[PDB]
Design a protein around this ligand. Structure first.
Ligand SMILES: O=C(/N=C1/NC(=O)[C@]2(O[C@H](CO)[C@@H](O)[C@H](O)[C@H]2O)S1)c1ccccc1
Ligand SMILES: O=C(/N=C1/NC(=O)[C@]2(O[C@H](CO)[C@@H](O)[C@H](O)[C@H]2O)S1)c1ccccc1
Ligand SMILES: *Cc1c(COP(=O)(O)O)cnc(C)c1O
Ligand SMILES: *Cc1c(COP(=O)(O)O)cnc(C)c1O
Lengths: 810, 810
């Protein structure tokens, strides 16, 4: 149908049709009479999968022959979403499969909706890993993603009576056609036990064993015939485990619980034993696999030349002491040589400065679970602190500040400190964040080892986040500048020479209108909710958190509503305000915020005087597949975190690429987005980092804002008095109390500027032509935020490998 | 190579080779360089599976169109063993696959050894279900096996220091290529809750729900293109189950434990809640599936015309009250009509008279778990006892004897009584057993309803138990009488006219010698144990149980050893005595018997004076795949249960078919085997049922035998004094105490006759020609013991359907 979706050749369509029928018959054991719509999805999935296999085998044998330096990306989260469409896009099969399925009397888009999201992540951190895998494959790097195959991913969110309810995401129910179990590479992982000191060295004995069974999932690069591997480990009990008889077999579940469920917390450290087991499990299995692959190319001097290990935050930080353990205890290297190898192999990425997110493990837990690792951590700490003491003699407070061991009521290991000590590179994920690391939380470490600290601004893959989710936009762009931009996103700059092109302006606006109509329909079909597609689509989708300030958006919404009620016959630009995202199950305030949003919707959406001028919708079960639908439909992107709290953000980049304008604070990557597009083409408001610091020095007093802003006072009085909860007048008392007395994120301080900035948004939306021209200026300068750029920088500046767009033979 | 294994045509071999390479590439994602031997097995398995699919689909659509009466065989056990070779045999692909794999540089028999047994049964009861499925398919019946897909089957037995150790049988580790998950037919199963009485009727409310997910496995008939289905249910928690968050997800394991593990008991009732849950789980899911299929052909008068339900013992007896529940509570039929339908639909097979095997469920368990079923059982009991009272007025003791409810310290439901009341047919599994049922434990029921009681003598499938495991014998038979006997085993009678044929005698003996050499090699390879292949192979393989009297065999072995030690320079016929079988994990005496057998081996096998004249080997991990190896190798079959205890036996029939002579008591099917072959061609010894009864009336005094038999006294003194356990002199004190004071199975009473009979065995073995002629007379009269005969009888006399050998189109 459209060019960017590839050719629909006669032979390929014919071959796809017969392979589809082959899988329906032989693989699914059905015929067309009893075939369910899900059967048709699986037949298509297997058919597309067949086209991956040759390239997958060829890629991996190519790496075996050439023996390039291997990149190992260790993460507890990989938020992959759906795989079918992405695979077709990257193999240039989308039009062929569409034609083939159409000829068999099936709608391919309907089949695509049957696939479950692989929701093995919470949000930005997990999705970044996913985008990164795509870019590493597209850039021809010998890269492997290593993680845990959770039986249950992020929970499905149901809204009941305006409240979040969680239900288990049983994503493997119907099977996963994309993965291949590799039981032959099953490896043992040890827990508990004790350390014995022999004449030869330390030995870790009397351990409990859990098996790690790998499942491999293909990661196709964009039309370069590269197919890399994501290897996810599943926990298995050994056959002699606990070996009355029946109970012993049933107790195998204990060992296998390690890979059962993803911890559902975003930017929050929960110091539970099961989480620690997961962290060691992935690290121990992965490192054995790495070393096996290295040996099968004795001399570990070359280890850092052939291996790079990227730690996705501190979650896999045990790789550092585990690598030391293997090198010292098993391979019998001397400490100093092992440490050199470890440091040169490992690099660490920090993703947040929020103090509640930092991993600080109780010593007593490590003592019991990983006794040898604790000993190694103590030794690392002693040698590291000796270096600090020699560099800064007499500075005893520096020693205690930099220690891996935090003293106190309960002693804890600071895993960030461990990572910095044991890595040759430490990076933040946006320029402002990386500077904050050097000036605040890692200041001492930067002073000791400045060369170690880098920036790598985050990015998103333009395959999933433009071509896949917004084919209409990708097409009208391709008509002007060709298709090269899909793997070279900087070429979008060529679109600046079309900002005054009348045809292009009309096409850009038409694509957005189409996306909005399609999404408005989706809302009525799958959720029976009615919206005006001519309204400004005002969207905030991301995890629910105080720092992200969904509450500030809520205050604006209520302000708009109150202004309409005061002057009902005055014209206002119609808006559909959409907010979506999951709250961590134990995060009370986040759950209260969800309830507030739905309660506002209940009032606003049923007020006859408002009409269809203001609608407030909570988007249920926000996830990657929903992001692919809503982001192309958005006019306005809400990126309104308190300055200094959002390390980067990546949703911001997705919206910019898809033709939404951004209202936001100078936080995370918003700073660089504004710099790229020009501040005149961004709706910037609010305190800068420096303003937040000044307010903190003086003391944040929310009462002052309440006293001086009448519109704000009215809203707080409405909340307190039960205007939005008639039958439960005190329902939102916790929210009001927090805002007035314990608001860490200064919602009131940015309220006035936010509301004024929102008026400037509405003003511009009244002039479609100039709105669209500003949009073109955003899309045109979004190139920097391709994860291809990000990964090229990791490759050159951290891993020491050169990327390549050279294709492998098909 | 050999005729009975089918044609190896050029096209078929070519097509098999390319499909093998296709699966290796696309399905296993490997090439020949990194392909493990297990990968080659799976490629072959998938290739063979492809040839099943067309026939499977065609068979099931044929049943949908013709709408025959459907046979539903409900069992908690299906002991299937391996599937690859059986599938090839039944599809006539064995030679083609052998040729194809040979041309690819692979040994097919080596690949066959990689397949795990599907060990979803304990022994005879489970294996009978397996043989039955094969015969139902071969006889063209629209039959479905329904059971539980246990994650763990019967444990693997390891012998450590002469003791049984159990390890989990993780049979699904590498995947199961034969099964197809059918998540689309997932059904809810209810537990706990309470009964509410409305104006409309009873309602079962506030229940906990577990989901039953079916997996379908194909069951091919012998070269008739029929492929039937075995549907096994797996337990799944619903997604809202227990919905802190993490613990709620982890607690899903509780619900899913229902299908986790097979209860490892043979002929023993263990009244545990988990077992009761398994029993209801299979029944509830199956009945919904049956009713669904019946409705999709309102009026339940025709239900018994279109449905037969065969209860494999009382384990699925809850089908009776469940069917009543559905018909009365949900379909709103009046009680009397529902009962008529239920009785005409259900038939019950009893498999043992051992009192410890009979299911008697505590009322308090049923009360809590299945409150509505208990109410229905009470109502059934009241109406049944009213009939008894009208038939036998004043006979109050009969009423209490026949009651479904047993009064006492704990009230119990007798499930056998429930089954008799609610079935139109009740059968035993061998003539002597069925007569014992009518004379003893079901005497009262036979007097009330004599027409209900039948015999169906057990059988074995000649596909697995001759053609598959003993191709050499099948071939030399086929050379004389053709191949028709494989699905018409009575034709083996034609072999009687070859009993004086010199070529046939030599061929029969040569095949046995080959089998013995092959098995002797297997012992050295996989277990590094050395044996004389010229010795008489004396084999007792079956579950370890007191009633089976492995101990009596032990006494004979020690007698032989003692006689050799007394007269070392006298000639004796050399023997290799092989005993194998698993003990139930909680069965102390059975575990002591295993230890005794190994302890005897330790003494006998290392005594220089014995030499290679006597060897005692314990065959570790006896299972279906091992039976397929050892049974063809055997000369003498030990079937030596105390008269009246082995309901039928089926191992006995396997040995008869494979050219072993039988030493045995007149118990179970041994009686009919002797009758078929002629008593002169069987080594019959010991008490008959009537002799056991006379001894019981008088009182069994083991001391009397000890006092009057010096050779027996010597053995008991050896056991007691520590001759077979030097470092642990009192190790076998429990065994001696049991034999002398608490022997339910009268081991000493048959000792003298057993030993004398064993001398007659040795005497005949000295004359190879006459030994072989007696063997021919056994093989020739083994036809009655084909499960095809058994199933034809069930079909005509119980289910009301006609079997057929007519082929379906390929
Ligand atoms: O740091 C955590 N989660 C994050 N989630 C994110 O989205 C963060 O990483 C993204 C990718 O770098 C950033 O864009 C985002 O700003 C940051 O909050 S960091 C975290 C911390 C502890 C446990 C689980 C997750
Ligand atoms: O009856 C049980 N087991 C049996 N196992 C057998 O092998 C029996 O059935 C066979 C098939 O009919 C008979 O050949 C055998 O004699 C009998 O013991 S009965 C049983 C009883 C309770 C729980 C589990 C199993
Ligand atoms: C991109 C993405 C995120 C991250 O969004 P932010 O606005 O940067 O927090 C979270 N969830 C999903 C499903 C995403 O696709
Ligand atoms: C046939 C068979 C049995 C039953 O043997 P009996 O001697 O009748 O108890 C038990 N186990 C296996 C593995 C079998 O094949």
């Amino acid at each position: 149908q459209i060019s960017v979706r590839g050719l629909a050749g006669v032979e390929n369509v014919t071959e796809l049709k017969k392979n589809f029928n082959r899988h329906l018959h032989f693989t699914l054991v059905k015929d067309r009479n009893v075939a369910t719509p899900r059967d048709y999805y699986f037949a298509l999935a297997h058919t597309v999968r067949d086209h991956l296999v040759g390239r997958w085998i060829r890629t991996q044998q190519h790496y075996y022959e050439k023996d390039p330096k291997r990149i190992y990306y260790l993460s507890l989260e990989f938020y992959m979403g759906r795989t079918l469409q992405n695979t077709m896009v990257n193999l240039a099969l989308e039009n062929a499969c569409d034609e083939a399925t159409y000829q068999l009397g099936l709608d391919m888009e309907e089949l695509e909706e049957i696939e479950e999201d692989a929701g093995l992540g919470n949000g930005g951190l997990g999705r970044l890993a996913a985008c990164f895998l795509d870019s590493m494959a597209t850039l021809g790097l010998a890269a492997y993603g290593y993680g845990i195959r959770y039986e249950f991913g992020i929970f499905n969110q149901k809204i009941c009576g305006g409240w979040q309810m969680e239900e288990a995401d049983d994503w493997l129910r119907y099977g996963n056609p994309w993965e291949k179990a590799r039981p032959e590479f099953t490896l043992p992982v040890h827990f508990y036990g004790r350390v014995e000191h022999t004449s030869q060295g330390a030995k870790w004995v009397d351990t409990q064993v859990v098996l790690a069974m790998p499942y491999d999932t293909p990661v196709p690069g964009y039309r370069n015939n590269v197919v890399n591997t994501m290897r996810l480990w599943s926990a298995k009990a050994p056959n002699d485990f606990n070996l009355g008889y029946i109970q012993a077999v049933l107790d195998r579940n204990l060992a296998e619980n390690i890979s059962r469920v993803l911890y559902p917390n975003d930017n929050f450290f929960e110091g539970k034993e099961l989480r620690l087991k997961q962290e060691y499990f992935v690290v121990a299995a992965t490192l054995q696999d790495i070393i096996r692959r290295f040996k099968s190319s004795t001399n570990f001097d070359a280890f850092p030349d052939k291996v790079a290990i990227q730690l996705n935050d501190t979650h896999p930080s045990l790789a550092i002491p585990e690598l030391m353990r293997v090198l010292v205890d098993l391979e019998r290297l001397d400490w100093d040589k092992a440490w050199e190898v470890t440091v040169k192999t490992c690099a660490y990425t920090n993703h947040t400065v929020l103090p509640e997110a930092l991993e600080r493990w109780p010593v007593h837990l490590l003592e019991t679970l990983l006794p040898r690792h604790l000993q190694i951590i103590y030794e690392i700490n002693q040698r590291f602190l000796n270096r600090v003491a020699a560099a800064f003699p007499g500075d005893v407070d520096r020693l205690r500040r930099m220690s891996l061991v935090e003293e106190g009521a309960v002693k804890r290991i600071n895993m960030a400190h461990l990572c910095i000590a044991g890595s040759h590179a430490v990076n933040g994920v946006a320029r402002i964040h990386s500077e904050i690391l050097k000036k605040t939380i890692f200041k001492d470490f930067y002073e000791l080892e400045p060369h170690k600290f880098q920036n790598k601004t985050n990015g998103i893959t333009p395959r999933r986040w433009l071509v896949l989710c917004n084919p209409g936009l990708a097409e009208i762009i391709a008509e002007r500048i060709g298709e090269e931009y899909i793997s070279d996103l900087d070429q979008l700059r060529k679109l600046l020479s079309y900002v005054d092109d009348e045809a292009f302006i009309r096409d850009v606006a038409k694509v957005k209108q189409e996306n909005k109509l399609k999404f408005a329909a989706y809302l009525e079909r799958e959720y029976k909710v009615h919206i005006n597609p001519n309204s400004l689509f005002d969207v905030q989708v991301k995890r629910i958190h105080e720092y992200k300030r969904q509450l500030l958006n809520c205050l604006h919404v209520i302000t708009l509503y109150n202004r309409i009620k005061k002057e009902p016959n005055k014209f206002v630009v119609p808006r559909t305000v959409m907010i979506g995202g999951k709250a961590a199950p134990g995060y009370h305030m986040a759950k209260m915020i969800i309830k507030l949003i739905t309660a506002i919707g209940d009032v606003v959406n049923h007020d006859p005087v408002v009409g269809d001028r203001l609608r407030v919708i909570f988007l249920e079960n926000y996830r990657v597949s929903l992001a692919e639908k809503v982001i192309p439909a958005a006019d306005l992107s809400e990126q309104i975190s308190t300055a200094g709290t959002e390390a980067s953000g990546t949703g911001n980049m997705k919206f910019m690429l898809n033709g939404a304008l951004t209202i936001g604070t100078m936080d995370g990557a918003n700073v660089e987005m504004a710099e790229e597009a020009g501040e005149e083409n961004f709706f910037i408001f609010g305190m800068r980092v420096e303003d937040v610091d000044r307010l903190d020095q003086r003391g944040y007093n929310a009462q002052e804002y309440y006293d001086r802003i009448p519109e704000l006072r009215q809203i707080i009085e409405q909340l307190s008095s039960g205007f939005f909860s008639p039958k439960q007048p005190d329902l939102f008392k916790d929210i009001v109390n927090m805002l007035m007395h314990h608001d860490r994120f200064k919602v009131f301080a940015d309220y006035e500027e936010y509301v004024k900035c929102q008026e400037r948004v509405s003003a511009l939306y009244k002039n479609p032509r100039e709105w669209t021209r500003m949009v073109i200026r955003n899309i045109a300068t979004s190139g920097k935020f391709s994860s291809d750029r990000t990964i090229a920088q990791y490759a050159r500046e951290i891993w020491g490998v050169e990327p390549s767009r050279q294709r492998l033979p098909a």
